[PDB]
Structures are given as C-alpha cells and as structure tokens.
C-alpha cells in the first residue's frame, strides 16, 4: 500500500489542472491525478422531489439529482468536491505452487 500527495506546485499548473482538479480546484495537498466533480444523490422520481430539491437547470422527473454542497439553494459550478482518488487501498498477490 502507499499514499501519494502533492505539496507544492506552480500556480499555472495548479490552475490548468493537468495533474488533477480538472482546473476547478488546486490539486496541492491531494493525490496525484485526483479529480473534482459534482455529487449524484440518485435521480428524481417525482415532481414533488424535483420541487423539494434545490433548484437546478434542467431538473425534471428521471434526471440526476446533484447535491448542494454549499447549501446556497442553487446548483452551479461551485457545488463540486473531491470525488476521485486513483490510489488503491492495497494491492496484493499470491503464488501457489504444488508438486
């Protein structure tokens, strides 16, 4: 097992996010290649659910419901968080030889 982290990085590299963050948030302090995206809280199943959820463009019945991270009542590009970590918890192998 191992843990990876980026401690310092040039400002333009952090901004364009070639090493992670998708250009939305700086990868500094996070795993190499980590990505930032929305959070999918299931799908809408009724107009009541659509109305009760925080307002978002294109919401309808059967569409994906995105969590309101900042509790502002509206879903936008600020409602994103670290969702992907390309580092396994642990990798193992086993070789068995019978004669």
């Amino acid at each position: 097992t191992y843990r990876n982290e980026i401690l310092e990085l040039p400002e333009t590299v952090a901004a364009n996010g070639k090493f992670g963050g998708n250009g939305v948030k700086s990868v500094v302090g996070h795993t190499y290649g980590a990505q930032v995206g929305y959070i999918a809280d299931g799908i809408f199943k009724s107009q009541d659910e659509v109305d009760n959820h925080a307002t978002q463009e294109g919401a309808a019945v059967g569409r994906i419901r995105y969590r309101d991270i900042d509790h502002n009542g509206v879903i936008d590009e600020r409602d994103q968080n670290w969702i992907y970590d390309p580092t396994p918890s642990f990798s193992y192998g086993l070789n068995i030889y019978l004669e």
Binding site: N16, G17, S26
Partner: peptide, 9 residues
C-alpha cells in the same frame, strides 16, 4: 476564464 483568474491570483 476561471483558469486565468486562478492563475493570476
């Protein structure tokens, strides 16, 4: 662009 704004903090 947000990338440019982030780059020029």
């Amino acid at each position: 662009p947000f990338e440019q704004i982030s780059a020029s903090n």
